[PDB]
Design an enzyme around this catalytic site. Structure first.
Site, PDB file in Angstrom:
ATOM      1  N   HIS A 356       0.909  -0.916  -0.412  1.00 50.68           N
ATOM      2  CA  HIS A 356      -0.315   0.168  -0.226  1.00 50.68           C
ATOM      3  C   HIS A 356       0.303   1.594   0.082  1.00 50.68           C
ATOM      4  O   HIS A 356       0.506   2.324  -0.469  1.00 50.68           O
ATOM      5  CB  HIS A 356      -0.649  -0.188   1.149  1.00 50.68           C
ATOM      6  CG  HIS A 356      -2.221   0.732   1.456  1.00 50.68           C
ATOM      7  ND1 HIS A 356      -3.035   0.887   1.613  1.00 50.68           N
ATOM      8  CD2 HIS A 356      -2.059   2.665   1.167  1.00 50.68           C
ATOM      9  CE1 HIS A 356      -4.033   1.955   1.629  1.00 50.68           C
ATOM     10  NE2 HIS A 356      -3.020   2.803   1.705  1.00 50.68           N
ATOM     11  N   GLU A 357       1.996   1.562   0.672  1.00 53.91           N
ATOM     12  CA  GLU A 357       2.283   2.245   1.459  1.00 53.91           C
ATOM     13  C   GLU A 357       3.919   2.345  -0.091  1.00 53.91           C
ATOM     14  O   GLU A 357       3.808   3.664  -0.475  1.00 53.91           O
ATOM     15  CB  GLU A 357       2.840   2.367   2.256  1.00 53.91           C
ATOM     16  CG  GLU A 357       2.583   2.252   3.923  1.00 53.91           C
ATOM     17  CD  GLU A 357       1.187   3.531   3.815  1.00 53.91           C
ATOM     18  OE1 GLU A 357       1.705   4.430   3.319  1.00 53.91           O
ATOM     19  OE2 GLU A 357       0.065   3.069   3.640  1.00 53.91           O
ATOM     20  N   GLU A 384      -5.505   7.283  -1.845  1.00 57.69           N
ATOM     21  CA  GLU A 384      -5.379   6.358  -1.231  1.00 57.69           C
ATOM     22  C   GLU A 384      -6.227   4.840  -2.568  1.00 57.69           C
ATOM     23  O   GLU A 384      -5.816   4.237  -2.182  1.00 57.69           O
ATOM     24  CB  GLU A 384      -6.636   6.424  -0.167  1.00 57.69           C
ATOM     25  CG  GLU A 384      -6.845   6.202   1.294  1.00 57.69           C
ATOM     26  CD  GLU A 384      -4.966   5.660   1.552  1.00 57.69           C
ATOM     27  OE1 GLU A 384      -4.535   7.410   2.190  1.00 57.69           O
ATOM     28  OE2 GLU A 384      -4.613   4.516   1.658  1.00 57.69           O
ATOM     29  N   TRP A 459     -29.523  12.339  12.526  1.00 58.98           N
ATOM     30  CA  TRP A 459     -28.542  11.148  12.756  1.00 58.98           C
ATOM     31  C   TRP A 459     -29.054   9.762  13.014  1.00 58.98           C
ATOM     32  O   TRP A 459     -28.665   9.270  12.144  1.00 58.98           O
ATOM     33  CB  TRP A 459     -28.000  11.755  14.009  1.00 58.98           C
ATOM     34  CG  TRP A 459     -26.719  10.231  14.144  1.00 58.98           C
ATOM     35  CD1 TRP A 459     -26.071   9.567  15.224  1.00 58.98           C
ATOM     36  CD2 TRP A 459     -25.451  10.872  13.160  1.00 58.98           C
ATOM     37  NE1 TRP A 459     -25.182   9.084  15.429  1.00 58.98           N
ATOM     38  CE2 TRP A 459     -24.278   9.629  13.605  1.00 58.98           C
ATOM     39  CE3 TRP A 459     -24.702  11.350  12.178  1.00 58.98           C
ATOM     40  CZ2 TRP A 459     -23.699   9.441  13.729  1.00 58.98           C
ATOM     41  CZ3 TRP A 459     -23.495  11.014  11.314  1.00 58.98           C
ATOM     42  CH2 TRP A 459     -22.844   9.398  12.098  1.00 58.98           C
ATOM     43  N   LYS A 463     -29.429   6.701  10.473  1.00 58.86           N
ATOM     44  CA  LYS A 463     -28.162   5.333  11.189  1.00 58.86           C
ATOM     45  C   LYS A 463     -29.556   4.005  10.639  1.00 58.86           C
ATOM     46  O   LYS A 463     -29.739   2.965  10.150  1.00 58.86           O
ATOM     47  CB  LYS A 463     -27.803   5.538  12.334  1.00 58.86           C
ATOM     48  CG  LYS A 463     -26.689   6.012  12.577  1.00 58.86           C
ATOM     49  CD  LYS A 463     -25.155   5.261  12.229  1.00 58.86           C
ATOM     50  CE  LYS A 463     -24.343   5.386  12.923  1.00 58.86           C
ATOM     51  NZ  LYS A 463     -22.974   4.308  12.766  1.00 58.86           N
ATOM     52  N   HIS A 487     -12.879  12.024  12.275  1.00 60.83           N
ATOM     53  CA  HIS A 487     -12.964  12.909  11.059  1.00 60.83           C
ATOM     54  C   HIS A 487     -13.789  14.072  11.420  1.00 60.83           C
ATOM     55  O   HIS A 487     -14.097  14.562  10.789  1.00 60.83           O
ATOM     56  CB  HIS A 487     -12.827  11.517  10.278  1.00 60.83           C
ATOM     57  CG  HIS A 487     -12.683  10.963   9.951  1.00 60.83           C
ATOM     58  ND1 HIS A 487     -12.298   9.586  10.549  1.00 60.83           N
ATOM     59  CD2 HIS A 487     -11.254  10.806   9.097  1.00 60.83           C
ATOM     60  CE1 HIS A 487     -11.522   8.431  10.280  1.00 60.83           C
ATOM     61  NE2 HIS A 487     -10.699   9.274   9.254  1.00 60.83           N
TER      62      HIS A 487
END
Lengths: 597, 182
Positions: A356-357, A384, A459, A463, A487
Site C-alpha cells: 500500500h505505502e 488512497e 442522525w 442510521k 474525522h
C-alpha cells in the site's frame, strides 16, 4: 506590457520557493515522526509555521492575478490553490475562535476518559481499552457500556464545540464564495473550467446518492447475514426484522465491520490466508518484504525505488531507542526524496500495507514531475485508492504463489474464497453506508438543513434508514454522536473514503481488464502485466494538473465514478448472501429499537 | 592542457555566472578525463569519444558550473529550459563535449546549499555562449519598479541543494568544453 497570466512567472517563483520550503517542512516533519525529541518536535513546528506563513504571503500575492484572465488549464489550477484563501478571510477572532474550537475538539477526542460505575478510577480512552473492548469484548453489556458512555462523557461535551464549529465554518466557507462548509469540502471535487469534464460540487451529492442506491442490496444482504450471525452470539438481543444495535458492529461507531469477522464467518473451520506463519520459515527481514514489493511495482513497469529511498526511509522499525510514530506513511519529502515511515513487523498485514505505502510512493514519484501545487491526487480519493488497489493485488492468493509463501499446491476452496471475500466486504461494505450517511448528515447540517434541535434526531433517523443501525439508547440533542468519530471532531472530510472505495474498485477492474484477467475480480492480481502499468501510470503521472474526471477516464475509461466495479468485485458472495438469507428477512425496519422492547 | 584541474575545482561557478577557462596549446592529454569519475553524462556531439586523442583543434574553453540532475539534459544544442534559455545556451552547431557528474556531497549541505544560483527569470533567452552576470531586478510584469514585492522579481534563484535529494535534484558539476578553430 505584461499578460495577466504573468502569474506564470509568479508561479515559477512560487514553485521553487514552495519546493524548497515544503522540503524543509517535510524533512523536519520526517525526522520527528521517526526520532521524536523535544528539539525534533520544536524543529517540526518551526518549519511548519514558516511554511504556513509562506503559503499565507504567497496567497496574498496571488490575490493579484484573477482567474478570469487565466487560460492554461494548469496555471489557473495553481492560482486557485494559492488564492483559495480559506480560513484567512474569516475574521480574526473567528478563525481563531474556531481554531481553539478545533483544538478543543481534537483534545477531547484524543484525551477522553470513560470508566465503569464499579471502578470510577479505572478509566480508559477510546484509544486504549475502549477500542479493544469494541473489538474483543463482543458482549452486549460491556459493549453497550463504553458506547453510550463514550457518547455521553465525550459526545455531550463535543456537542457545543461542534455547534459553534458548524456555524464558524459556515461563514468561513461563505466568505470563500461558497454556500456552506459542506460545499467547501465538495469543492475538492469541483472540475469546471474543463470542456466536457464539468463536475460541479452538488454533482458529488447527486452521484453519491446514485451510487449508494446500487450499493444498497449488496449491503442489505450483508447486513441481513451479519444480523443472522449476531443472533447466535447475542441470541436474545437482536430482532430478526430490525436494525443492528450500534455497539455490536465491531467498533465504536460501526464504521468498519471487520471486527465482526470472527462472529460472521462463512465457514469457520477453513482458515483464512495468513502468510505470517509462512514467511518466518523463510526468515524474511524488514527489507525483503519491501524488496519484493518494489519487485511487484517493477513487474508492472513502475520504475525502481530510488537509492534515496532505501538509505533514507526507516523500514527496519524505529529501533527500540528513539521514539517513532509507527503509522505506515508514504512520504513525499520534496525534491525527489520519497520515503516510507512504516514499522514493519513480519506479518501478512504488514506485507499488504507495505505494498500500500509503496503504491502511494509510486504515485508520488509519478506526479513529482508536475508543478508543486499540482503534486497531489487529482481529487480526495485517488491516492488512497491507488494504495488499496496495490494492497488488493498483493493480497490475492495467486500473487502469493510466485512468491514462495504459499506452497505450489494451494487452492482456495470457494469456502475461503467466500471467507476472505466476506472479510473484505465487512471492511469495504459497512463503511460505505456509514461514510455516505455521516457525510450526508454533515452536508445537510452545514446548509442548516438539519436544525440543531434536530441534529441527533436526523442522525439516528439516517442510521436507521441508510446504515440500518439502531441506537441502543435514545440520544436527545445533548449528544453529538458523529463528533465521537475522529474525522468529525477533527475537521476531516469523510466522503473521501466513499469516493476512494469507488475509485479503488474501478481502478482494480480497469487494471484487471488491462491485465487480461479471466476469473473473478477478487482473484485478480495485476503483477507481471506491464500493460496495466502503462494504464494507471497514465493517471499517476497526472496530479491535480488535469481534472479528476479526466484522470478517471484515463485509468478507468468512465467520466464519473462508478459502483459497478465494486459490485462486480462482490458478485461472488453476493450470490452467496442471497442464498444464505433465503430465510432471513433481507433489510431492516427503522422502527425497531432495543429499548423499545 | 588543464583537465586534471578545471573539473575538480571546489566551489564550481554557479550556472548563471558560469566560469570559462581557456585551454591553450599544450600536451593535450585529455584522454585522462575518462579515468577521473563515473560521469553521469558524457555526450560528445561534434566530436567522437573515440576520436578525442587523435583529432586536434586550435582553442579550447572549459565552461564549468553546477546544475541539477533534471537539468543536465538541458545542456545540449537546443533543448530549451531555464538552464538553456536563461543560464547556459549551447549553439546548435556545438562541437565540444558535455561532461556532467554527480557531486551530491561535494556540493550539498544538510542545512541547505544556498550558494549555487540559477536565473529563473529573464527578459530574452540567452544567445549561444552568452553570459548574463547582471543581477538587476526582473520586471516579471509591467509597472516598472524599484524593489521586489510586486510582480517585479529577483532574477537569480538559489538551488537549495541538500546532502540529500533526488538524483535529478542532486548537484551536478558540469565542466563543458568549447572547441573552436581560427
Amino acid at each position: 506590457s505584461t499578460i495577466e497570466e504573468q502569474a506564470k512567472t509568479f508561479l515559477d517563483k512560487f514553485n521553487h520557493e514552495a519546493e524548497d520550503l515544503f522540503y524543509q517542512s517535510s524533512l523536519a516533519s520526517w525526522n520527528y515522526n521517526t526520532n521524536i525529541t523535544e528539539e525534533n518536535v520544536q524543529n517540526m513546528n518551526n518549519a511548519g509555521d514558516k511554511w504556513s506563513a509562506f503559503l499565507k504571503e504567497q496567497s496574498t500575492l496571488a490575490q493579484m492575478y484573477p482567474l478570469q484572465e487565466i487560460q492554461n488549464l494548469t496555471v489557473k489550477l495553481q492560482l486557485q490553490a494559492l488564492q483559495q484563501n480559506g480560513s484567512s478571510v474569516l475574521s480574526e477572532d473567528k478563525s481563531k475562535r474556531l481554531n481553539t474550537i478545533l483544538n478543543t475538539m481534537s483534545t477531547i477526542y484524543s484525551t477522553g476518559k470513560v470508566c465503569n460505575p464499579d471502578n470510577p478510577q479505572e478509566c480508559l480512552l477510546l484509544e486504549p481499552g475502549l477500542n479493544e473492548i469494541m473489538a474483543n469484548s463482543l458482549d452486549y453489556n460491556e459493549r453497550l457500556w463504553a458506547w453510550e458512555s463514550w457518547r455521553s462523557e465525550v459526545g455531550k461535551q463535543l456537542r457545543p464545540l461542534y455547534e459553534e464549529y458548524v456555524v464558524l465554518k459556515n461563514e468561513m466557507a461563505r466568505a470563500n464564495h461558497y454556500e456552506d462548509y459542506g460545499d467547501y469540502w465538495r469543492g475538492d471535487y469541483e472540475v469546471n473550467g474543463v470542456d466536457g469534464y464539468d463536475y460541479s460540487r452538488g454533482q458529488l451529492i447527486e452521484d453519491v446518492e446514485h451510487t449508494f442506491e446500487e450499493i444498497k442490496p449488496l449491503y442489505e444482504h450483508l447486513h441481513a447475514y451479519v444480523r443472522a450471525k449476531l443472533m447466535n452470539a447475542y441470541p436474545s438481543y437482536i430482532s430478526p426484522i430490525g436494525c443492528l444495535p450500534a455497539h455490536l458492529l465491531g467498533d465504536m461507531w460501526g464504521r468498519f465491520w471487520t471486527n465482526l469477522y470472527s462472529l460472521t464467518v462463512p465457514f469457520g473451520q477453513k482458515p483464512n490466508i495468513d502468510v505470517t506463519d509462512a514467511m518466518v520459515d523463510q526468515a524474511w527481514d524488514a527489507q525483503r518484504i519491501f524488496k519484493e514489493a518494489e519487485k511487484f511495482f517493477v513487474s508492472v513497469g513502475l520504475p525502481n525505488m530510488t537509492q534515496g529511498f532505501w538509505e533514507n526511509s526507516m523500514l527496519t522499525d524505529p529501533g527500540n531507542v528513539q521514539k517513532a510514530v509507527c503509522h505506515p506513511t508514504a512520504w513525499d519529502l520534496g525534491k525527489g526524496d520519497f520515503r516510507i515511515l512504516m514499522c514493519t513487523k513480519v506479518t501478512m498485514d504488514d506485507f499488504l500495507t507495505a505494498h500500500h505505502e509503496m503504491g502511494h510512493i509510486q504515485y508520488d514519484m509519478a506526479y513529482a514531475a508536475q508543478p508543486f501545487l499540482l503534486r497531489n491526487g487529482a481529487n480526495e480519493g485517488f491516492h488512497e485508492a491507488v494504495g488499496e488497489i496495490m494492497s488488493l493485488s498483493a493480497a490475492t492468493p495467486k500473487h502469493l504463489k510466485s512468491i514462495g509463501l504459499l506452497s505450489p499446491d494451494f487452492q482456495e476452496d470457494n469456502e475461503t474464497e467466500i471467507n476472505f471475500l466476506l472479510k473484505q466486504a465487512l471492511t469495504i461494505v459497512g463503511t460505505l453506508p456509514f461514510t455516505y450517511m455521516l457525510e450526508k448528515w454533515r452536508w445537510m447540517v452545514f446548509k442548516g438543513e438539519i436544525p440543531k434541535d434536530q441534529w441527533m434526531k436526523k442522525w439516528w433517523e439516517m442510521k436507521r434508514e441508510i446504515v440500518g443501525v439502531v441506537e441502543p439508547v435514545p440520544h436527545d440533542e445533548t449528544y453529538c454522536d458523529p463528533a465521537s468519530l475522529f474525522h468529525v471532531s477533527n475537521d476531516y472530510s469523510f466522503i473521501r473514503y466513499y469516493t476512494r472505495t469507488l475509485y479503488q474498485f474501478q481502478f482494480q477492474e480497469a487494471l484487471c481488464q488491462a491485465a487480461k484477467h479471466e476469473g473473478p475480480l477478487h482473484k485478480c492480481d495485476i503483477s507481471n502485466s506491464t500493460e496495466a502499468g502503462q494504464k494507471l501510470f497514465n493517471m499517476l503521472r497526472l496530479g491535480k494538473s488535469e481534472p479528476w474526471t479526466l484522470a478517471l477516464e484515463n485509468v478507468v475509461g468512465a467520466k464519473n465514478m462508478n459502483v459497478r466495479p465494486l459490485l462486480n468485485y462482490f458478485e461472488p458472495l453476493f450470490t452467496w448472501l442471497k442464498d444464505q438469507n433465503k430465510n432471513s428477512f433481507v433489510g431492516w425496519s427503522t422502527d425497531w429499537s432495543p429499548y423499545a422492547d | 592542457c588543464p583537465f586534471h584541474e578545471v573539473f575538480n575545482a571546489t566551489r564550481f561557478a554557479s550556472v548563471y555566472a558560469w566560469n570559462r577557462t581557456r585551454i591553450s596549446n599544450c600536451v593535450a592529454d585529455y584522454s585522462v578525463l575518462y579515468n577521473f569519475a563515473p560521469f553521469f553524462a558524457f555526450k560528445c556531439y561534434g566530436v567522437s569519444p573515440t576520436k578525442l586523442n587523435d583529432l586536434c583543434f586550435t582553442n579550447v574553453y572549459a565552461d564549468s558550473f553546477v546544475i541539477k540532475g533534471n537539468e543536465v539534459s538541458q545542456i545540449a544544442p537546443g533543448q530549451t529550459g531555464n538552464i538553456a534559455d536563461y543560464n547556459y545556451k549551447l549553439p546548435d552547431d556545438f562541437t565540444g563535449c558535455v561532461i556532467a557528474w554527480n557531486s551530491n556531497k561535494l556540493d550539498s549541505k544538510h542545512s541547505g546549499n544556498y550558494d549555487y544560483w540559477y536565473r529563473s527569470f529573464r527578459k530574452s533567452k540567452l544567445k549561444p555562449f552568452e553570459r548574463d552576470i547582471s543581477t538587476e531586478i526582473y520586471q516579471a510584469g509591467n509597472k516598472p519598479c524599484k524593489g521586489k514585492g510586486p510582480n517585479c522579481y529577483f532574477p537569480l534563484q538559489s538551488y537549495g541543494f541538500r546532502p540529500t535529494y533526488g538524483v535529478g535534484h542532486q548537484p551536478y558539476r558540469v565542466v563543458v568544453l568549447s572547441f573552436e578553430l581560427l
